[PDB]
Amino acid sequence: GSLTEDGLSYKEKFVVRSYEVGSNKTATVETIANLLQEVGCNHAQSVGFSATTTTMRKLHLIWVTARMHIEIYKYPAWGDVVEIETWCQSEGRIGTRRDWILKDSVTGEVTGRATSKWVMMNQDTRRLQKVSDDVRDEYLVFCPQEPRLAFPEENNRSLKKIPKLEDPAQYSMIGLKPRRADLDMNQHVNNVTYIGWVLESIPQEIVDTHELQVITLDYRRECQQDDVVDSLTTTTSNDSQFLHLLRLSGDGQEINRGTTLWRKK
Amino acid sequence: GSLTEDGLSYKEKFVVRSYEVGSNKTATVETIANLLQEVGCNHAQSVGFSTDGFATTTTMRKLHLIWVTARMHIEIYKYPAWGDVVEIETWCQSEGRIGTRRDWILKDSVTGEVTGRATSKWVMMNQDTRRLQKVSDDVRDEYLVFCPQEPRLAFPEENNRSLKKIPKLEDPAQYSMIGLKPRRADLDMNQHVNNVTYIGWVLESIPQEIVDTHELQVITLDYRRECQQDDVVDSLTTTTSDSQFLHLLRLSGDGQEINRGTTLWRKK
Ligand SMILES: O=C(O)c1cccc(Cl)c1
Ligand SMILES: O=C(O)c1cccc(Cl)c1
């Protein structure tokens, strides 16, 4: 990959691998999510972040994902070359936003697009705080100055409020644990693993007859190495809609909530 | 990647990715194992064989016959760091009518040094029946033209590590992790649990203090029976000693064996 001409976005090419495809001989949303985070990491390194600044490292401050929204038109096939462009922007003191565009390399057409909100947090106390000038002024030089939105539409489906699923849930998958391969280098559960967990309680009937178009996922609380998660899903509707909740299998503490949209194969 | 000059092996380069690295900012053996399968698929496609993981030929598909991993053996000297470029060469080789063998060599692309090597034994099996059967001469004729004719061995040494007999762990196990289920991302396009997930499950019951002080050098895994989508696994480990462990996977219920293995760990 490489920074674009104007040094305000980053592009990278990927060849979809045999182990990255699912039931439809096409790439899973989890794989696509992995490619989002990889190109995110390449961009952060390209401009010298490591995604903390020296100011952030001094104050033990980290970015964490508050929300993730992914929309896929076409899942790329094994051996297909996909191009992903990414950029991130200030939302002032609220936090940053990273956005992605996925293209078919050969035809040049948009096959998916994604957006995510990141909030600034104390590493140790786990306490969210508004973004200060010093921090903003260090990263604003690496962001397009004009607004550039992957989801421009004046009311798109990335910024709607996700309600809490109510017991009893229609579908459930019980006793979900992360394994050591689900842990980043810092022993924090990978963000893409929550996506797997949410989809675990989607019914087989739907996997068989429908394909996933849109997923929106709120991050409330991280799941630790020795936590257990229950995955809850209820229908809310050609198209199929589902309300989702991850919560700790014991006391039922919420870690994630979300929505998915499925179109008929 | 590409078939080498003589069309009897296949070479491919990988750039190690952020999500591919573990606790020591280096690639997991699960990622390595993934890249081994990837280059194996790329080789099988480049010479016209099946891309299903089963690597079927013409006189195999109609007899409903598939290749199945009986055994896998991996040794890593160095684990590639994030952004490091790694080159993997793979080839296939006939083992009489007992089955086929696939080997790999890992190199650091920059220094050309060997940093890992692997070998695996495949057996032919009728899908629907889960049988076995030795290989026929009619099948061999159309896959021996794609193998080096003279023997070529990742682990050439006569009576080496990859060919020792692994015994059944006896209750009680020293370490256990129980109630392990596969998720949908653990299943290939055929809807079978991908054989790299077993590697993951075996290491789940490695003590944490060993993860903190040692690095994994060797793993050897026997594949007895496939775990279904709706099966549950317990992972059992016992120290046999450098640290050595004996491993067992078995259905959480009736304790039906699915895998046995050994791992060798070196001090960091
Ligand atoms: O939504 C699902 O059930 C799902 C989850 C992971 C992979 C696939 Cl193909 C489907
Ligand atoms: O069990 C282990 O040692 C293990 C398994 C997966 C990843 C890592 Cl870093 C370690």
Curated annotation (Swiss-Prot), chain A:
Keywords: Chloroplast, Fatty acid biosynthesis, Fatty acid metabolism, Hydrolase, Lipid biosynthesis, Lipid metabolism, Plastid, Transit peptide. It is found in: Plastid, Chloroplast. GO terms for molecular function: fatty acyl-[ACP] hydrolase activity. GO terms for cellular component: chloroplast. It catalyses: (9Z)-octadecenoyl-[ACP] + H2O = (9Z)-octadecenoate + holo-[ACP] + H(+). It comes from the Eukaryota. Its EC number is 3.1.2.14. The active site is at residues 186, 188, 223. GO terms for biological process: fatty acid biosynthetic process. Its main location: plastid. It is an enzyme of class 3 (hydrolase). Plays an essential role in chain termination during de novo fatty acid synthesis. Possesses high thioesterase activity for oleoyl-ACP versus other acyl-ACPs. Substrate preference is 18:1 > 18:0 > 16:1. Belongs to the acyl-ACP thioesterase family. This is Oleoyl-acyl carrier protein thioesterase 1, chloroplastic. The gene is FATA. The chain holds residues 75 to 359 of 362 of the full protein.
